[PDB]
């Protein structure tokens, strides 16, 4: 019956992520953010990527954990804001969800949406793999090239991460 399920997961992703981006208190922001991260992991897992989405969900999660620790630490009100608490946040949430449902309407019941490109509005079973003989689940080797051919790239990556560590240490020390 349903077929657009990747697009529908994208719609849920954009709803939660716009309510994220409308800036309420970071508690509710993180709630909508982890909802968005989980359904984005579902998008990329259902699209063909095996582990990369579950990986990035884990990483992004741990980032949001530390972000929650610091928003408990520093930014607290006498009573923090929710989506339905203040005028401006409520207006932004309604208007963002309005633009979302309007795009849903122009994709579903119309032909073409031309805001920045002439996006072909139909279902995303196209384009897709036409049953090619993988036998090794392409993205696994596609990440496994990083230690085979990836000489210079992980050198500068680890070097910049080491510099990131000492940078955080010296900015905290510089009192």
């Amino acid at each position: 019956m349903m077929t657009y399920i990747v697009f529908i997961l994208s719609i849920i992703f954009v709803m939660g992520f716009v309510g994220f981006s409308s800036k309420p208190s970071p508690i509710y922001g993180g709630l909508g953010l982890i909802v968005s991260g989980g359904v984005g992991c579902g998008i990329v897992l259902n699209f063909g990527g095996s582990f990369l989405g579950l990986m990035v969900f884990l990483i992004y999660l741990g980032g949001m954990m530390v972000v929650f620790g610091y928003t408990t630490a520093m930014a607290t009100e006498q009573y923090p804001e929710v989506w339905v608490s203040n005028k401006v946040v409520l207006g932004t949430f309604i208007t963002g969800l309005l633009m979302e449902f309007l795009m849903v309407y122009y994709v579903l019941k119309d032909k073409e949406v031309e805001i920045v490109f002439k996006f072909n509005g139909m279902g995303d079973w196209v384009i897709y793999d036409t049953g090619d003989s993988g036998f090794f689940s392409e993205e696994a080797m596609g990440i496994a090239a990083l230690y085979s051919y990836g000489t210079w790239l992980v050198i500068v990556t680890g070097w910049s991460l080491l510099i990131g560590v000492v940078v955080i240490m010296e900015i905290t020390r510089g009192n």
């Binding site: 793999d129 993988g134 689940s137």
Partner: peptide, 8 residues
């Protein structure tokens, strides 16, 4: 079915 080959 692990991989694409066994799937086909």
């Amino acid at each position: 079915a692990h991989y694409s080959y066994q799937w086909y």
